[PDB]
């Protein structure tokens, strides 16, 4: 199936306390494999998955250098953005960055992305074709000109199209037991009477990887959108995920409703009935 | 593998 490599960076200013919190984590699809925490004692990019441990010193010294370069850039950016918006030194603010590349079943480059947000809102983003920025505000317009002057998009694009995919290919090989597995959902249904006249049907999917899944409720072969509640897909803690969808139904009508499960390790979707 | 391409906004 398709795969991705994504890095995520979070920078949180703490007025009156000194340096902002900086956290970085790196993912291959839904498996984290590296991390850095401004508050941990090592000040090194740390491994989080067995297969990245094979990389030797130059890889680690490099990623630590790079992650620190991100840390420092964010640290300045918090100050710069406060000025861009004439905000005071009083409140805590957040910068977030996310970039990465996607590849198809052939492991060939599909797409790249690089976006940046301040205070939880889109600030600036590389366009789909990796050649220009989308900057909605005036502040982002200012940034856009600076990044143009320093050939940021040209150099990012080279990274995202080459280095990003080459190392994803490498990771997928080095951790093929971990990363290339497809664990199919284990499914079941529970039932709890709400009132005299209603009952909850809950559709359960457990221990699946990857996290991408679809759970849909169905009355009489038609797609339910009314009374239907879907929780956030949630990590079990062992590299698998869980999700449920519930639907409130009139008592004695249960057999009108089907749950439909779609996932990569199911050749056909599952139709569950109560 | 992270990028080196980051610049002050």
């Amino acid at each position: 199936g398709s795969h991705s490599m994504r890095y995520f960076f979070t920078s949180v200013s703490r007025p009156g306390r000194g340096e902002p919190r900086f956290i970085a984590v790196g993912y291959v699809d839904d498996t984290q494999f590296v991390r850095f925490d401004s508050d941990a004692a090592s000040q090194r990019m740390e491994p989080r998955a067995p297969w990245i441990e094979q990389e030797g010193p130059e890889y680690w010294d490099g990623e630590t250098r790079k992650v620190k370069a991100h840390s420092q850039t964010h640290r300045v950016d918090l100050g710069t953005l406060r000025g861009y918006y004439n905000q005071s030194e009083a409140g805590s603010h957040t910068v977030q960055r996310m970039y990465g590349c996607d590849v198809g079943s052939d492991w060939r480059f599909l797409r790249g992305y690089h976006q940046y947000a301040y205070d939880g809102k889109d600030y600036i983003a590389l366009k789909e074709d990796l050649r220009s920025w989308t900057a909605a505000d005036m502040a982002a317009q200012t940034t856009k000109h600076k990044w143009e002057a320093a050939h940021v998009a040209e150099q990012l694009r080279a990274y995202l199209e080459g280095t990003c995919v080459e190392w994803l290919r490498r990771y997928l090989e080095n951790g093929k037991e971990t990363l290339q597995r497809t664990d199919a959902p284990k499914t079941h249904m529970t039932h709890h009477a709400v009132s005299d006249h209603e009952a909850t049907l809950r559709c359960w999917a457990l221990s699946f990887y990857p996290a991408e899944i679809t759970l849909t409720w169905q009355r009489d072969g038609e797609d339910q959108t009314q009374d239907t509640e879907l929780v956030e897909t949630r990590p079990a803690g062992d590299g698998t995920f869980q999700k449920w969808a519930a639907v409130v139904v009139p008592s004695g009508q249960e057999q009108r409703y089907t749950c439909h499960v779609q996932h990569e390790g199911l050749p056909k979707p599952l139709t569950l009935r109560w | 593998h992270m990028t080196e391409v980051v610049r002050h906004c």
Partner: T-cell receptor
Amino acid sequence: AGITQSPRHKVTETGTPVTLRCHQTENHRYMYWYRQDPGHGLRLIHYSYGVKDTDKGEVSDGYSVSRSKTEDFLLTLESATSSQTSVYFCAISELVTGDSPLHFGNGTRLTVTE
Amino acid sequence: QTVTQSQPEMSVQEAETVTLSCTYDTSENNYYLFWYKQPPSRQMILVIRQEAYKNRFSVNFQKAAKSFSLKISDSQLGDTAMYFCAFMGYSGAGSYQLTFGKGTKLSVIP
């Protein structure tokens, strides 16, 4: 370019405090204080990435800086030492790249007499 | 990150050509290099600029070799100066600043 350092020449008694003032008209974000000494080139004392944002260069110690406003970067020596007899250079940059280089002021000859 | 000017002093006969050496160290793909001329006025005058990504004074930019020599042909007496090589990072060590070499005092001889 439009830097002016104040003062251009100074003599100061060992243990006195003295301040050097670098002033720009350009409204540029990045300012620097370097000192030039025989056998060391120019070495960075402190820098500032923006208002009230300063950090240490490689020859930090003995020197403080302040970035109250954008236009001024002040170099301060709490207690003058003879080792701080040097030529002091301020620098300004808009983006710090090849096409937006550091522009230097004309320097300040300071000697710390006993 | 560091810059190396291995020759503190050099001489040239007037109208002849001279080459000042400069090497640098960096772990980064992108960066910028500079030559500054400092005449007896003490001003720092930018003479050459170079971006790593991509007239009597010329540079031989050898990126693989990390070498950035400055050639002055047809030396005038006005070229008597101290010449500085400077390094500027992109994102990595020494980004947003210049790191200088130790300088070469060039004396042009009539």
